[PDB]
């Protein structure tokens, strides 16, 4: 899935959490496991420059630490630039996923009580951006 790579990259590469844009704006219910995803970024922001051990130390006693270590062992990448690029691609995947969800909500709005010219172009423009990426 898309989540396992994301968490695996983050645990293996704690320095990636610094360059993560905020996620609290969108509800975490949309994507499973996204609630802790922003929390890890918040922990990194509160304590910039932390090793993987420090990141795992904060949640040594948590019940989700097993998944973090398991994904860390999985898909081990020696290259760091590739990991950064992959995380960017994975993060880019989430951004359009949020846009797709917004498009779906707009489509439901369309099928509920139609659309007007302003609503049509708004959803229509949103589709182009989603299609472009």
């Amino acid at each position: 899935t898309t989540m396992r790579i994301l968490i695996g990259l983050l645990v293996q590469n704690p320095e990636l959490a610094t360059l993560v844009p905020p996620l609290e704006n969108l509800d975490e219910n949309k994507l499973p496991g996204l609630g802790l995803f922003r929390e890890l970024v918040n922990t990194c922001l509160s304590q910039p420059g932390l090793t993987t051990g420090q990141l795992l130390e904060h949640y040594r006693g948590t019940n989700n630490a097993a998944t973090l270590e398991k994904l860390s062992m999985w898909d081990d990448i020696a290259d760091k630039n590739i990991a950064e690029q992959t995380f960017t691609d994975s993060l880019n995947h989430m951004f359009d996923s949020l846009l797709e969800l917004r498009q779906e909500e707009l489509i439901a709005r369309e099928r509920t009580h139609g659309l007007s010219n302003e609503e049509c172009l708004e959803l229509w423009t949103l589709n182009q951006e989603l299609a472009k990426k």
Partner: protein, 448 residues
């Protein structure tokens, strides 16, 4: 139940990656094939996209779905929904190389496991197959895997890689105080001047008229190669028994006329001189010999490999002579038989990185010409012999042909062909009584 090795996640990565990107196709086609996929649905999908790519058409969900539908494999793989999920799952095609290598590794181990099962089944139930049959079958299966794995990076290397390898070799040669003679010393300084020793991976050919100088000269090369080196030298005497050539060699190293040696007289005055030479040979243990009349290229390759992987590399190989080797399959045509033998000998030299000396006979067309000096075209059952040879030496003695000759006892080696180096002639004195060739210390002529 032991699940056969495979990585579905790795596979789902490459199919999804190839979905997103078409340019990286060659990056995966060189690494994996349809069969290597563990699941039949993946095999069918790989086959379908290969047909799509070979047609010069783009790869996309519509095309792949359409292609599978025409061939009826759309439902067998899962249908349109299954393909859509595969495309969506893969984030990007950046890491498709490692995934492909992993898939190839899984397939190879899967093949190895099946081979292990296959060999085990045969052992349990010989079904009339002898232990040799099982030994041969296992050896073939191991070889087939080894050769399949052999071609990994065989491709059009760029010049930058080629240049770096070459300059390293040149610097190696320059540093080593070889001072000429990069290969095995021939023992004759004049010959080494033009040849610089017998280079590795070469196919040297010594040719002459019947009973002219062939086995005498070739044995001298073998003796010198053994004396001036520390690597075993192999001899294939398909024409005459090992007892006779050893006797000839003992005379050559002792400089005592054969005469009595053939009869078997251990005369004290001479036996003292030869005494010690057997001691020198015994301590060195540098020479291996196998007449085994009527060999085939495969048998020669098998025996050579065993010697190489037992004492460590080879120093030289001698064949006496080329025309006596037989290829069972290509028996109807003699021309093709010689081409197969010549090509095989060149391959063996490359494989073991050791000079290979082969002897050949000439044609009767030589006598017709006024000037009875051999040329490349005089080889017998020839044509393919002179294409693959890296160095060709003809043994000529004008004394035999013209009794009124100035070359009395002075043989001359004519370098008919040399791929890397000049050609010419070198004069050597011929000691028939001792069956030996010696450096021409007398007034030497100059090549035209």
């Amino acid at each position: 139940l032991k699940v056969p090795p495979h990585s579905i996640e790795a596979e789902q990565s490459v199919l999804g990656g190839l979905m997103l990107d078409n340019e990286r196709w060659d990056d995966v086609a060189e690494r994996v094939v349809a069969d290597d996929f563990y699941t039949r649905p993946h095999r069918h999908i790989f086959t379908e996209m290969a047909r799509l790519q070979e047609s010069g058409s783009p790869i996309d969900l519509i095309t792949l779905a359409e292609s599978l539908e025409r061939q009826g494999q759309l439902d067998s793989v899962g249908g349109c929904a299954y393909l859509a999920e595969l495309s969506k799952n893969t984030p990007s095609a950046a890491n498709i190389s490692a995934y492909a290598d992993i898939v190839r590794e899984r397939a190879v181990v899967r093949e190895m496991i099946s081979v292990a099962n296959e060999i085990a089944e045969a052992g349990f139930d010989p079904q009339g197959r002898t232990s040799e049959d099982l030994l041969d079958l296992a050896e073939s299966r191991v070889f087939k895997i080894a050769e399949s794995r052999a071609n990994k990076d065989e491709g059009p290397k760029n010049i930058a890689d080629v240049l770096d390898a070459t300059v390293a070799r040149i610097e190696q040669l320059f540093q080593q105080p070889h001072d000429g003679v990069t290969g095995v010393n021939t023992g004759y300084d004049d010959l080494n001047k033009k040849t610089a020793g017998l280079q590795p991976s070469d196919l040297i050919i010594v040719a002459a008229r019947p009973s002219m100088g062939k086995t005498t000269f070739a044995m001298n090369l073998v003796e010198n190669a053994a004396m001036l080196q520390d690597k075993p030298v192999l001899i294939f005497s398909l024409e005459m028994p090992s007892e006779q050539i050893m006797m000839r060699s003992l005379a050559s190293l002792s400089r005592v006329d054969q005469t009595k040696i053939r009869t078997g007289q251990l005369d004290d005055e001479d036996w003292a001189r030869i005494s010690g030479t057997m001691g020198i040979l015994l301590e060195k243990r540098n020479i291996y010999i196998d007449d085994s009349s009527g060999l085939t290229p495969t048998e020669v390759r098998s025996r050579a490999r065993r010697i190489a992987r037992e004492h460590g590399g080879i120093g030289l190989i001698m064949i006496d002579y080329l025309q006596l080797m037989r290829v069972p399959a290509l028996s109807d045509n003699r021309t093709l038989e010689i081409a197969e033998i010549s090509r095989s000998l060149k391959a063996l030299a490359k494989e073991l990185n050791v000079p290979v000396v082969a002897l050949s006979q000439l044609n009767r067309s030589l006598e017709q010409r006024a000037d009875k000096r051999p040329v490349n075209s005089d080889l017998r059952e020839s044509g393919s012999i002179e294409q693959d040879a890296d160095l060709i030496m003809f043994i000529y003695r004008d004394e035999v042909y013209h009794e009124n000759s100035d070359l009395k006892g002075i043989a001359e080696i004519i370098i008919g062909k040399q791929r890397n180096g000049p050609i010419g002639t070198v004069r050597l004195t011929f000691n028939g009584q001792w069956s030996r060739f010696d450096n021409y210390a007398g007034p030497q002529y100059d090549d035209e």
